[PDB]
């Protein structure tokens, strides 16, 4: 039986700017680094950055909707978004769903998100206003 997400590994084209982005800009804790990768944590999340020459710096129009959302409190959301904006981090989507969301790109074009709100909160909103074809279990 699977008990949760063990780790998220992102392939990166250049290790130093990716470490700078996740550790310094996004405030994650750097636990270890080696010639071809790094381990960071963000709350319970174990993040691995893996240097991979096959990673392309990918424009958002050229990747699908797969994306990775990090939790932040409502009270902290606006100043964190402003920090990303000051740093020139690109946005790939505007928020049109429930709960604050900021959609931003990492240095290689990985699609990231800041989101406020849990699955329970989303399900409650969906029960009141179900998406087309929505069934609950």
Nearest to 33 by CA among 19, 22, 44, 52: 19
Q: Which of 59, 64, 104, 107 binds a second copy (CB under 8 A)?
A: 64
DSSP 107: T
- Complex with a second copy: residue 32 or 88, whichever CB lies closer: 32
Distance between CA atoms of 29 and 31, rounded to whole angstroms? 6
- Contact between residue 8 and residue 45 where contact means Cβ atoms under 8 Å apart: yes
Query: Does 69 participate in binding Mn ion (rule CB under 5 A)?
Result: yes
- Contact between residue 42 and residue 29 where contact means Cβ atoms under 8 Å apart: yes
113 is in an annotated binding site: yes
Query: Does 52 participate in binding a second copy (rule CB under 8 A)?
Result: yes
Q: How many residues bind a second copy (CB under 8 A)?
A: 67
Start-to-end CA distance of the chain, whole Å, equals: 20
Query: Does 125 participate in binding a second copy (rule CB under 8 A)?
Result: no
Binding site for a second copy (CB under 8 A): 1-11, 26-28, 30-37, 39, 41-46, 48, 50, 52, 54-56, 63-73, 76, 80, 98, 110, 113-115, 117-119, 122-123, 126, 130-137
């Amino acid at each position: 039986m699977l008990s949760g997400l063990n780790h998220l590994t992102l392939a990166v084209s250049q290790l130093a700017p990716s470490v700078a982005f996740y550790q310094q800009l996004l405030g994650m804790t750097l636990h270890a680094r080696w010639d071809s990768g790094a381990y960071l944590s963000c709350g319970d999340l174990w993040l691995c950055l893996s240097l991979d020459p096959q990673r392309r710096v990918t424009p958002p129009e050229e990747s699908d909707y797969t994306h990775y959302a990090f939790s932040i409190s409502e009270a902290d959301f606006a100043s964190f978004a402003a920090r990303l904006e000051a740093a020139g981090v690109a946005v790939w989507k505007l928020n049109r769903s429930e709960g604050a969301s900021h959609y931003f790109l990492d240095p290689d074009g990985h699609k990231l998100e800041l989101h406020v709100g849990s699955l329970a909160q989303r399900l409650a909103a969906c029960r009141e206003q179900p998406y087309k074809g929505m069934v609950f279990f």
